[PDB]
């Protein structure tokens, strides 16, 4: 019965494939040469940078590194606003709450720990230590000051109540390590890529997987939603990025090049969604034209692999962290 | 500047000095990756152990601070986080000789880390544990592990030396040494072995940087 249902889904997906996105996008002007330059270089991290996240004001950003430090930067002046020492130096993710009042981070300690930035005292303190995951924390993201989704290497994602400090919902169905997480604009759904080479759309309130997406040949390292919320992009160890549509329930576009033979670490869209930016193991970030699947530009100012990247909410700038212990801001 | 911007820049400079001080303090540590099968003597490998995600013990030996990280316990995809320990000075790989069915799992695990892309150039300090229990056990079960190849004498020093050669057969690259040591859990001084191997590794890297190697 499982084989018949899987075949039925394949037949159902094929029926909705009257045309490819390449054909419908054949008669628009190419984006052209996208040349960005390093406008700021943030220095002060002394080890590999694994994650970063912009604040909603598009000026403040948090970065996490293997030196056991979590730094909040003022990108405009390059001022260091806070330097938060971490109990565990094996952080792999960090988050900045939409209000700006909190940041979160976690990693091989299997805990996404919450920090309060705005206290009557002048110092930052730990608010909560969300324990309950069996594997390493790979990604957590705030919905509000009281709710945070986590993804973990134990093949599950969890929605936490920060006040009580326990899982409100546990999202299960992945057969491999979950590596990345991306909340929809409305925060009613989120997508998630894992080491089983598939992506799953989950409903936050009901607790279950709506859709499952396949096509990748290796681990999915990174995932990001399109600004519409009706599609998402994935980045994988098979040197490929793929665009998935939720309503069509299948692949649309593939971003690859024969000279690219290295994994993808991070992905992010532009404000309009026309540019798909991806970090790579070959020490550069490639700017893909999302609609036409053409390479539009390269950011080649890192001496080690680009581990993370993020575009501002106003779309004015993009950040890139790397294993060379530097962050750069590009325009 | 606005005189609040000046105070913010002063605060940023103080944060920078604190970051530099913490970096200077952290730079004098020897980071070591502990590996091996379960019940292979990983935990009780050194007497000094001051400290289910990741366990980090540490000890001081001859004014050198050692940090040993036991990654056994994650039980997840190893390739997704083993790159975190890319900058360790060396790897400590423990093997239980008295376990004749985990000998092949240990040998296969040794290949994976020896031929890792992130550890091609990382030296390994090999510990062959439980030699006291190996000598008393070899008299009964002589040939229950390396069935095809072993056609040598059944002495304690003969099969033990043969097991050692099998592990160092897997070092398929230059600039990496394997420092094999035979240990017994009764009474030993394993900090000297790690300290001596680390000094040799650091001297080798220093000569490589200077160009003499």
């Amino acid at each position, epitope marked *: 019965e499982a084989e018949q249902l899987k075949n039925q889904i394949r037949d159902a997906r094929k029926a909705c494939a009257d045309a490819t996105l390449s054909q419908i996008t054949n008669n628009i002007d190419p984006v052209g040469r996208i040349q960005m330059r390093t406008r700021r270089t943030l220095r002060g991290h002394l080890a590999k940078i694994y994650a970063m996240h912009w604040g909603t004001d598009s000026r403040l950003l948090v970065s996490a590194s293997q030196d056991g430090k979590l730094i909040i930067w*003022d990108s405009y*002046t390059t*001022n260091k606003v806070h330097a938060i020492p971490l109990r565990s130096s094996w952080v792999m993710t960090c988050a900045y709450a939409p209000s700006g009042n909190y940041v979160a981070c976690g990693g091989l300690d299997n805990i996404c720990s919450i920090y309060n930035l705005k206290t009557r005292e002048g110092n930052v303190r730990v608010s909560r230590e969300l324990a309950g995951h069996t594997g390493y924390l790979s990604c957590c993201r705030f919905l509000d000051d009281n709710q945070i989704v986590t993804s973990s290497g134990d093949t599950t994602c969890a929605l936490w109540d920060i006040e009580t400090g326990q899982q409100t919902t546990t999202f299960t169905g992945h057969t491999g390590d979950v590596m990345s997480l991306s909340l929809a604009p409305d925060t009613r759904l989120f997508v998630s890529g894992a080491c089983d080479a598939s992506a799953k759309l989950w409903d936050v309130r009901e607790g279950m997987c709506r859709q499952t997406f396949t096509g990748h040949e290796s681990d999915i390292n990174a995932i990001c939603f399109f600004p519409n919320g009706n599609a998402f992009a994935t980045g994988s160890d098979d040197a490929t990025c793929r665009l998935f549509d939720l309503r069509a329930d299948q692949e649309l576009m593939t971003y690859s090049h024969d000279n690219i033979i290295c994994g993808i670490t991070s992905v992010s869209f532009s404000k309009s969604g026309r540019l798909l930016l991806a970090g790579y193991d070959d020490f550069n970030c490639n700017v893909w034209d999302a609609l036409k699947a053409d390479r539009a530009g390269v950011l080649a100012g890192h001496d080690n692999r680009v581990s993370c990247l993020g575009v501002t909410d106003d779309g004015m700038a993009v950040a890139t962290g790397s294993w060379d212990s530097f962050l750069k801001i590009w325009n | 500047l*606005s*005189a*609040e911007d000046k105070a*913010a820049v*002063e*605060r940023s400079k103080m944060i920078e000095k604190n970051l530099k001080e913490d970096g200077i303090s952290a730079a004098k540590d020897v980071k070591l990756l502990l590996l091996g099968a379960d019940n292979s003597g990983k935990s009780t490998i050194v007497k000094q152990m001051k400290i289910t995600g990741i366990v980090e013990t540490h000890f001081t030996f001859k004014n050198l601070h050692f940090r040993l990280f036991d990654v056994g316990g994650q039980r997840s995809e190893r390739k997704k986080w083993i790159h975190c320990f890319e900058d360790v000075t060396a790897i400590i790989f423990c093997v239980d000789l008295s376990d004749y069915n985990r000998m092949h799992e240990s040998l296969m695990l040794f290949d994976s880390i020896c031929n890792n892309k992130f550890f091609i150039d990382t030296s390994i300090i090999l510990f062959l544990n439980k030699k006291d229990l190996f000598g008393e056990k070899i008299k009964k079960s002589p040939l229950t592990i390396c069935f095809p190849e072993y056609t040598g004498p059944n002495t304690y020093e003969d099969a033990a030396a043969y097991i050692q050669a099998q592990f160092e057969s897997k070092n398929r690259s230059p600039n990496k040494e394997i420092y094999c040591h035979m240990t017994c859990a009764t009474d030993t001084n394993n900090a000297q072995v790690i300290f001596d191997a680390v000094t040799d590794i650091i001297i080798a890297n220093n000569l490589r940087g200077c160009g003499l190697y």
Partner: single-chain antibody
Amino acid sequence: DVQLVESGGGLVQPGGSRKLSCSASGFAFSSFGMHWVRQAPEKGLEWVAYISSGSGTIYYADTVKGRFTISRDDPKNTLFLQMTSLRSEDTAMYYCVRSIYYYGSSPFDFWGQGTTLTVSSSDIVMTQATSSVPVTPGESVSISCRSSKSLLHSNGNTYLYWFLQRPGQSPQLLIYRMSNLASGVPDRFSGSGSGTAFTLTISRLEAEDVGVYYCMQHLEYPLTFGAGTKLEL
């Protein structure tokens, strides 16, 4: 809780010397810059001295330069003010104020209860035109303040601060940088202004809104207050 307790003073002869202290408690004292502000009897506030976090920057008002000395003891969580050659003009209630400076911070957010000193016998001008305004509970009020120089800096910030000193109490921050409500302040208070003309609006007056309202600039040192406008019921 945050606490700043000043001590030392009460009566000194002219030409004498006295040392003021301020014991900090309940906050990371080393992270904050500290100020001394004094209030003469039946007069407004006047900034005295400032010492930054780490003691890298020190400033003094012109009326006290050379005579007064501000120092700091971070392990002891204590701030000091050594005064020499005291004059009749130094009779005032001396206040201890914490200030932290980063992007989005709140300087001047907490004041001590003050210590009284009695001596027995270019600069931006802040103009608060009205001196007293009779008010009714439930009515809306609009206090105004003027500045000689434009407080709008090129970085987009307008460095104007509002303080409310209730009868018998130390002043409390209301607005910082001309628009931002301070923590713990009700939403009735609002701040508006442009360059030189500024106003603080109260929507529905309460019995606890009775007191003197001061405007302060922080564009450049020395920090200057305006003669506050009293509100009476």
